[PDB]
From a paper:
There are three parts to the flagellar structure: the trans-membrane basal body that functions as the motor, the connecting rod and hook, and the flagellar filament that acts like a helical propeller. Our current understanding of supercoiling in bacterial flagellar filaments, referred to as polymorphic switching, is based upon the notion that protofilaments within the flagellar filament can exist in two discrete states, that differ slightly in length. The “short” state results from a protofilament having a right-handed inclination (the R-state), while the “long” state results from a protofilament having a left-handed inclination (the L-state). To reconstruct filaments at high resolution, all protofilaments must be “locked” into the same state, either L- or R-type, producing straightened filaments that lead to non-motile bacteria.
While the three L-type mutants (E115G, S285P, and S17P) have a left-handed 11-start helix, the four R-type mutants (N226Y, A233V, H84R and A39VN133H) have a right-handed 11-start helix, and the designations L and R correspond to the hand of these 11-start helices. The L-type 11-start helices are tilted left by ~ 1.7° and the R-type 11-start helices are tilted right by ~ 3.9°. Strikingly, we found those sites are not necessarily conserved among different species or participate in unique inter-subunit interactions. These include three straight mutations outside of the D1 helices: S17P, S285P (both within D0) and the double mutant A39V/N133H (within the loop region). We also identified several straight mutations that are only involved in the 11-start interactions: S17P, H84R and A39V in the double mutants. We also detected two mutations, S17P and S285P, located in the middle of the small coiled-coil D0 domain. These two residues are not conserved in other species, and proline is not found at this position in any wildtype species. Therefore, mutation S17P or S285P in B. subtilis forces a local bend of ~ 30° in the helix axis, and this conformational change makes the D0 coiled-coil adopt an L-type form more easily. Here our high-resolution reconstructions expand our knowledge and we can now observe how mutations in D0 can cause a switching of the flagellar structure.
Residue numbers in the entry:
A (entry chain A): 52 to 152
B (entry chain f), G (entry chain T), H (entry chain p): 3 to 51
C (entry chain J): 153 to 254
D (entry chain f), F (entry chain T), I (entry chain d): 255 to 304
E (entry chain J): 52 to 102
J (entry chain M): 204 to 254
The structure:
């Protein structure tokens, strides 16, 4: 039994480490999300003001967007828990072969 | 249990809350949503031309 | 002399930056295309060349010159678009840094 | 009409803009109260179990 | 990890320094721009009042 | 914008800075309690086995 | 067993804890993380220029 | 966070806002957009000749 | 124009000047709180290890 | 002179010098801490079996 509590307590540590990991990735995803909301605003703005907004400032919009793209890439890159890039979108992929996850 | 608690996300809100209020200020003072900042430099540049 | 910004807690996780505007930059064809395309801003062909010719030349006839002004405006506009883009990058940057850091 | 357009670029809803100035001040001060209290809690943790 | 937060915090400092830099240049460019607007007025005035 | 930059050099998060002033006082006082008790233990060692 | 115990690392924490609280104090009073101390004399010198 | 905030660009607007109102004043009093100031000294000099 | 020049010599930005009056009062009171607390700390040092 | 591209003056290897140095002292303290634990159960056995 005291074996069971030793393994228990270390598993509660592993659970808490879980919570901080999952919350790390989670909060990072909410930051990505906040970007994506601004992005959608930049889609209705890359709506071209329908067509009023000409190629010059379409490229300015593009500067802001691609900037934000590099930011989301930065979220998916920087988010390295214990050095483990959590939001590596290729790291835990269950492809055709499950072992690749 | 009692040595890393500082409401750390609150603490991250506070300068973003202040930041928000200073953006609000900044537009109220000019009376213009157009800021020196290039946030919406498209709309800026449009009304600039 | 790229004004990169060090951002990631890992090295070389950086933000490239570019600035190329100045008073001697205006309607940058590739650079100054002579008295026009940088140097109406600098040299200001308004002395008598404009009264010498007001339309027909286009290199003293107001056309290219107003285009020096107008594109110079578009350069500083696009430059402030680059910069504002970078500002927004720093917004979400520090938001991530505070979040993921927390 | 050009100045009206450009105005729409640079319009402010000073009603909204002041309302969110106000609100963001409220949320600031609120978050501040939450940080004070965030300091108050662990004080109690230790001193009630020191 | 605490290495990662030390480098993080200094990188947030570097980010803020970024914001003040980019805003310095930016505001300067808006001043240049205000000039350029007056300049354009001085092009239609250097319109020679036509002639 | 220069004074804003330099401000960022010399900014304080007075919320954080006060919170860690507080916290470091808590940790001081805590460590103090630990030194008192560190004195209390060997007193008991000797007097219970003198 | 009972003659060198003084919680000696605690005792080493205490002036470092106090030291920390005095650093905190020092910045709070100025309202400035910039200290007279040359700790981060780079950032110092930067805002000095 | 609370020691360099003075809405510094607002503060830069205020004497430019006042300045604007004094330009307005200045023209209203004369009833003339022509100022002593050489701003538009061309148009000035034109109506001077 | 002479009185305008001399005015520029003796101008005050009463907005700024009041803002820094205010601020310097804030910094005074802040520093005061820091001196009170500076007295509070060693009280605790001794009394927790007297 | 160079901030990224070289990696031998471009921050990459250098932050890796720091980071792995941290990992060396970490693994060294893992060796040592392992030895400490060995001395814990050691003296526990010595006191037990000795008793």
């Amino acid at each position: 039994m005291r074996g069971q509590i030793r393994g228990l307590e270390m598993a509660s540590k592993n659970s808490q480490d879980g919570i901080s990991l999952i919350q790390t990735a989670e909060g990072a995803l909410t930051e990505t999300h906040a970007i994506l909301q601004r992005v959608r605003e930049l889609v209705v703005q890359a709506g071209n003001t329908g067509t009023q907004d000409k190629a010059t400032d379409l490229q300015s919009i593009q500067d802001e967007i691609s900037a934000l793209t590099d930011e989301i890439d930065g979220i998916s890159n920087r988010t390295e828990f214990n050095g483990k890039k959590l939001l590596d979108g290729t790291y835990k992929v269950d492809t055709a072969t499950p072992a690749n996850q | 249990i009692n040595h890393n608690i500082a409401a750390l996300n609150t603490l991250n809100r506070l300068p973003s809350n202040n930041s928000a209020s200073q953006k609000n200020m900044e537009k109220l003072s000019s009376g213009l949503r157009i800021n020196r900042a290039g946030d919406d430099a498209a709309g800026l540049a449009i009304s600039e031309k | 002399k790229n004004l990169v910004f060090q951002i990631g807690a890992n090295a070389t996780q950086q933000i490239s930056v570019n600035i190329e505007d100045m008073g001697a930059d205006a309607l940058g064809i590739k650079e100054a295309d002579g008295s026009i395309a940088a140097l109406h801003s600098v040299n200001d062909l308004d002395v008598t060349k404009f009264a010498d010719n007001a339309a027909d030349c286009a290199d003293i006839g107001f056309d290219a010159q107003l285009k020096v002004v107008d594109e110079a405006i578009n350069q500083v506009s696009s430059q402030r678009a680059k910069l504002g883009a970078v500002q927004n990058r720093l917004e979400h940057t520090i938001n991530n840094l505070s979040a993921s850091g927390e | 009409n050009l100045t009206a357009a450009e105005s729409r670029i640079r319009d402010v809803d000073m009603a909204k803009e002041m309302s969110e100035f106000t609100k963001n001040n409220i949320l600031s001060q609120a978050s501040q109260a939450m940080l004070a209290q965030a300091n108050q809690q662990p004080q109690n943790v230790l001193q009630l179990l020191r």
